[PDB]
Write a protein that binds this ligand. Sequence first.
Ligand SMILES: Nc1ncnc2c1ncn2[C@@H]1O[C@H](COP(=O)(O)OP(=O)(O)OC[C@H]2OC[C@H](F)[C@@H]2O)[C@@H](O)[C@H]1O
Length: 252
Amino acid sequence: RWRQTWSGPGTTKRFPETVLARCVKYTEIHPEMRHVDCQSVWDAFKGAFISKHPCDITEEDYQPLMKLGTQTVPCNKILLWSRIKDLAHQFTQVQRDMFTLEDTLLGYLADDLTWCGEFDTSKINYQSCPDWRKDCSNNPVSVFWKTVSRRFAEAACDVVHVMLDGSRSKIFDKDSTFGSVEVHNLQPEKVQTLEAWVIHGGREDSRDLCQDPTIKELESIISKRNIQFSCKNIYRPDKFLQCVKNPEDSSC
Ligand SMILES: Nc1ncnc2c1ncn2[C@@H]1O[C@H](COP(=O)(O)OP(=O)(O)OC[C@H]2OC[C@H](F)[C@@H]2O)[C@@H](O)[C@H]1O
């Protein structure tokens, strides 16, 4: 058969094996997650999408998973990010002081993976999966992230940080998961300030990108939720990583 059902890439190779392994590595590495049954976790992950229509997935579908994956993370040490995945995780790799969603059990299990099934059959689809835009938004992957991302932002408190790509077309994009889901599920009762770190890309220094109009847009949004907004440029990304790595070379 010479045609695929969907426009999007199909399931990542060795998906069940890969999720289980990531679960084993995470629960052995993090002592508080040691109470977790990894096969039980996999079972709830499968049962969310297997034998289900990949355009008909719901938040409830993932509720079993969400319960088994319940995790407390330091609420004041949260780093959100939008369109700058690599630097944000390089950062939390060295600090370890701060946590992206990908640093939680659920985020870790799913980071960079694609998955879907078929209706009326229990097979995983290693051929193609629904593209969010060309096929349908309610697909196993898109619904997973939207659900875990909402809870993450719900869990945050005090000062929440967000990395942004200073060279992105729009530095802040209302339509990203950060912009459409996370900004709107921070709890004004618990969050004092959202602080944006705008990462410059070009050669060394530049503008004050915290004056960028999309950033002003983010600011107006967050201020009207009764949360303070602050912003800092990071004019030189690798001095930042020099300093984050070796926090007390006195060039820092
Ligand atoms: N047409 C599309 N094109 C791109 N992304 C799409 C599209 N349609 C849906 N998406 C979703 O949007 C994301 C791609 O945007 P991203 O990876 O740049 O950073 P986010 O702010 O989203 O996600 C990072 C923040 O949100 C959660 C963490 F806590 C971070 O702080 C993908 O994951 C997709 O699921």
